[PDB]
Amino acid sequence: TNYVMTTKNGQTIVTQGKPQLDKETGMTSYTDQEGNQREINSNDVAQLIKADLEHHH
Helix, strand or coil: CEEEEEECCCCEEEEECCCEEECCCCEEEEECCCCCEEEEEHHHEEEEEECCCCCCC
């Protein structure tokens, strides 16, 4: 349900659902925490990690 995106410039952004990548526009569209829909250059994305609900082990 939540993914955490880390950008090249160091920002941490939480998303609703897994962001989608278009290999034809070099864009990655996502939905922020306000349901707003955005898009970002796929090169500006360092990591895209599915959030865990809690810590374990």
